[PDB]
Amino acid sequence: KKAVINGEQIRSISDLHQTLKKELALPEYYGENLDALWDCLTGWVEYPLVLEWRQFEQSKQLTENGAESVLQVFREAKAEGCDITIILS
């Protein structure tokens, strides 16, 4: 499964969660917060997943490192053995 985040266009953490809910096909009841995203990466998302997060350093700016907290969740799932490839640009 391929998920693409255009990092220059996400200026709110809410729209980041909405864009994840669409690109990862999360459940309709997704809680739109970091603990729900961790529950979905360890129990719902399809794998292998490739997450292309373009213009990541721009997303860091606008969000205050709401972006870095999200990316840390994905890195922790990958470190537990979920088959995720993260490609930043």
Partner: protein, 96 residues
């Protein structure tokens, strides 16, 4: 912050079944049950890693893990319920 304290008899009856499984240490239905809960949004009081653990509350009919959980702390009867996929939590009062 926690959103209030709610009597256990005002929650779904499956939350009492989850508390009773925690007290016997399972067996649980989901492999996520009993893992450490990292409280990543800091809705619950900030504590070191390992203080909290999470457990599913079944939703009858859903066919997935759904949105309801109990998170335990280490203080006596320190159990929190979320019924909205971790967005809010209440403290459970098991005496009413």
């Amino acid at each position: 912050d926690v959103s209030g304290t709610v009597c256990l008899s005002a929650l779904p009856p499956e939350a009492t079944d989850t508390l009773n499984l925690i007290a016997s240490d399972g067996p649980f239905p989901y492999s996520q049950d009993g893992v450490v809960f990292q409280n990543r949004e800091s809705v619950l009081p900030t504590q070191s890693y390992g203080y909290y653990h999470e457990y599913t509350v079944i939703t009858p009919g859903a066919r997935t893990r759904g949105t309801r959980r109990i998170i335990t702390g280490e203080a006596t009867q320190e159990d929190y319920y979320t019924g909205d996929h971790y967005a809010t939590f209440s403290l459970i009062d098991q005496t009413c």
